[PDB]
């Protein structure tokens, strides 16, 4: 199916005037492959997947130089934003950035992303057309004007539509065995009787990749939302993901309820029922 490359950056100024934290992680789909951590001070872009560790020293030197450039960039941003909003240095603030590209089943470009957040809220974002910006507040409009005069969108578009896509295909090819896999979820249902009157049916999905999945309950073949609980998809720690959906039902009506599982790895959607 479709694939994506994503970079996520977190820059956190710390209380007082110490040195801010900078974190960069790279993903292909739901598989992380690089990282850079100032609290884990090695000063090198580090591999986190076997298919990227085969890249030569020129690649790692290049990414290391670039990730340091990214780090120093956000180091200025924290100070710039401190001025935009009139904030002292004594406080702790967070700058976040994400960018990347999507490709379809044919590995051709689909969409590009390049967006920022400050203290957990939108700051500025490049729209879908990759030519205009969305400024969340007055401060961000200063960035929008500056970046419009410098034609930043035109430069980022070339990277997102070109460079980003070209290197995603290389990553997908080098990590073909593991990046292009689809692990269908291993599903089962459990039954827990709270009392003589109610019972909880939990529908499990385990060891699936990628993370995208849909778990839904139905009663008599009709969607059921009341008396249900759904947890966030969670990582297993071995590259796969987990998720479950529960519903509280009256004793004797368990057979009315069905669990429906949709996943790209499944040949067909799954329907589970308590036997």
């Amino acid at each position: 199916g479709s694939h994506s490359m994503r970079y996520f950056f977190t820059s956190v100024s710390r209380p007082g005037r110490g040195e801010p934290r900078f974190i960069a992680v790279g993903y292909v789909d739901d598989t992380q492959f690089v990282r850079f951590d100032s609290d884990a001070a090695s000063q090198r872009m580090e591999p986190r997947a076997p298919w990227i560790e085969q890249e030569g020293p020129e690649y790692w030197d290049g990414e290391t130089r670039k990730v340091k450039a990214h780090s120093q960039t956000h180091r200025v941003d924290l100070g710039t934003l401190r001025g935009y909003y009139n904030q002292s240095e004594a406080g702790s603030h967070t700058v976040q950035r994400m960018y990347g590209c999507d490709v379809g089943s044919d590995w051709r470009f689909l969409r590009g992303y390049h967006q920022y957040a400050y203290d957990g809220k939108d700051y500025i974002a490049l729209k879908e057309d990759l030519r205009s910006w969305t400024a969340a507040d007055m401060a961000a409009q200063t960035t929008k004007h500056k970046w419009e005069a410098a034609h930043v969108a035109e430069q980022l578009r070339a990277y997102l539509e070109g460079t980003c896509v070209e290197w995603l295909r290389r990553y997908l090819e080098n990590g073909k065995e593991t990046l292009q896999r689809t692990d269908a979820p291993k599903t089962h249902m459990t039954h827990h009787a709270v009392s003589d009157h109610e019972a909880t049916l939990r529908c499990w999905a385990l060891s699936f990749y990628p993370a995208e999945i849909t778990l839904t309950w139905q009663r008599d073949g009709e969607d059921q939302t009341q008396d249900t609980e759904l947890v966030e998809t969670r990582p297993a720690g071995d590259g796969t993901f987990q998720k479950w959906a529960a519903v509280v039902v009256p004793s004797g009506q368990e057979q009315r309820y069905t669990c429906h599982v949709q996943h790209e790895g499944l040949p067909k959607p799954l329907t589970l029922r308590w036997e």
Binding site: G26, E63, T73, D77, L81, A150
Partner: peptide, 9 residues
């Protein structure tokens, strides 16, 4: 493959 250029807020 990171962006080669940088832009300041």
């Amino acid at each position: 493959y990171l962006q080669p250029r940088t832009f300041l807020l």
